[PDB]
Amino acid sequence: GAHMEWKLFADLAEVAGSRTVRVDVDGDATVGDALDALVGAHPALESRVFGDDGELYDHINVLRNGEAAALGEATAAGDELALFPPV
Numbered sequence: 001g002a003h004m005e006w007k008l009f010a011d012l013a014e015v016a017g018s019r020t021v022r023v024d025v026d027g028d029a030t031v032g033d034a035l036d037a038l039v040g041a042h043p044a045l046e047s048r049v050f051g052d053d054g055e056l057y058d059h060i061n062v063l064r065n066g067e068a069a070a071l072g073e074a075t076a077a078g079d080e081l082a083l084f085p086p087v
């Protein structure tokens with residue numbers, strides 16, 4: 001599908017064991033779908049990203065190509081996605 005890459009920081013990078021993670025998602029995959037692909041690649045991330053209700057924790061900052069992105073936004077091949085824990 002569409003290949004793209006996540007950058008992870010601080011404890012998220014530590015849990016994943018890498019500062020970068022490649023993912024490959026569907027053509028109409030959202031940012032949220034790309035985030036679920038990241039967590040599928042490194043399931044230990046799950047409880048550092050989502051609460052028991054499945055919702056993103058408050059204050060996590062998801063970027064797509066350097067701009068804040070909501071989980072329903074589109075993705076595209078070559079995207080640079082970033083996941084920062086709360087400031």
Ligand SMILES: [Ca+2]
Pocket residue numbers: 002026027028029074075076
């Ligand atoms: Ca797309």
Ligand SMILES: [Ca+2]
Pocket residue numbers: 052
């Ligand atoms: Ca519980």
Ligand SMILES: [Ca+2]
Pocket residue numbers: 080
């Ligand atoms: Ca770039």
